[PDB]
Amino acid sequence: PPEELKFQCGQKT
Amino acid sequence: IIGGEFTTIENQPWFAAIYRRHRGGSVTYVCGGSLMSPCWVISATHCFIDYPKKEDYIVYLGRSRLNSNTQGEMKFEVENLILHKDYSADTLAHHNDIALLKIRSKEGRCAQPSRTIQTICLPSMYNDPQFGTSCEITGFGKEASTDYLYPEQLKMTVVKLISHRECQQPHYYGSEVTTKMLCAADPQWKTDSCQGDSGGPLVCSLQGRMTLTGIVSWGRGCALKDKPGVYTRVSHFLPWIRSHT
Numbered sequence: 001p002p003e004e005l006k007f008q009c010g011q012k013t
Numbered sequence: 014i015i016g017g018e019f020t021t022i023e024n025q026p027w028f029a030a031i032y033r034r035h036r037g038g039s040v041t042y043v044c045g046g047s048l049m050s051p052c053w054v055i056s057a058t059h060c061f062i063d064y065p066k067k068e069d070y071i072v073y074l075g076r077s078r079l080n081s082n083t084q085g086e087m088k089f090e091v092e093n094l095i096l097h098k099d100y101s102a103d104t105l106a107h108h109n110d111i112a113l114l115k116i117r118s119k120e121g122r123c124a125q126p127s128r129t130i131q132t133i134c135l136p137s138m139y140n141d142p143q144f145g146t147s148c149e150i151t152g153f154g155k156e157a158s159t160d161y162l163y164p165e166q167l168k169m170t171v172v173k174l175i176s177h178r179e180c181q182q183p184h185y186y187g188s189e190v191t192t193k194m195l196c197a198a199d200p201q202w203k204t205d206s207c208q209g210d211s212g213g214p215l216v217c218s219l220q221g222r223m224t225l226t227g228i229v230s231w232g233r234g235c236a237l238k239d240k241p242g243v244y245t246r247v248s249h250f251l252p253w254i255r256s257h258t
């Protein structure tokens with residue numbers, strides 16, 4: 001699935 | 014930032030560093046910003062007002078240092094530079110001090126998520142934390158008001174939101190502060206944002222999310238007693254944000 005979906009606003013990894 | 018600790022981008026993955034090119038060869042830091050969605054960064058219009066030439070700015074994501082590179086950083090050009098039309102500056106305050114930068118890389122793409130690049134959440138319409146909430150600010154701005162250079166390492170600190178009632182006291186900022194601004198200070202007036210921190214984020218937890226509650230806008234001095242830092246109140250600009258992104 002496309003990279004963008006991996007953004008989760010507010011999360012730090 | 015006066016006070017605070019040095020940090021790394023992993024602790025603020027939505028922070029964007031904006032620089033300006035002078036074709037003589039130098040690139041200088043201008044302001045900070047925050048990544049909202051893959052192609053949009055938000056900052057302050059006052060950072061661009063004097064040189065609205067989008068082609069002369071460069072935006073970097075995944076950066077922990079100011080002039081050296083960080084592994085994982087991404088470089089973008091500004092495809093669109095939207096400044097607030099009702100932006101005004103008076104003796105201290107900047108009104109409607111929010112700006113949007115649409116970014117594009119040389120390959121033609123927007124940001125990709127990494128352990129150093131993440132978006133920050135936007136609040137819901139007119140929704141804020143209550144005064145007393147501790148929020149953090151980050152940036153490469155001055156560490157002392159008398160400095161003429163910016164730190165090379167990213168810094169961060171915590172400040173608490175204070176009420177408009179408190180910030181509008183005649184001995185603070187009076188009516189310079191409006192409902193479209195938020196004031197944040199450290200109880201001991203020891204740490205605060207300073208010159209160079211403009212455009213950056215004021216992050217507070219709101220409904221369980223780390224939310225972009227403010228954008229570093231203006232302040233009298235840095236870490237001065239009764240002189241809080243004033244931030245643009247993001248929650249009050251949601252219609253504006255949505256209309257352009």
Ligand SMILES: Cc1cc(I)c(O)c(C(=O)Nc2ccc(C(=N)N)c(Cl)c2)c1
Nearest residue numbers: 206207208209210211231232234235242
């Ligand atoms: C000429 C210039 C340029 C930039 I970029 C700034 O950030 C400033 C500036 O005054 N920033 C600035 C200074 C102090 C504070 C504060 N918290 N007290 C704040 Cl919010 C912003 C001035």
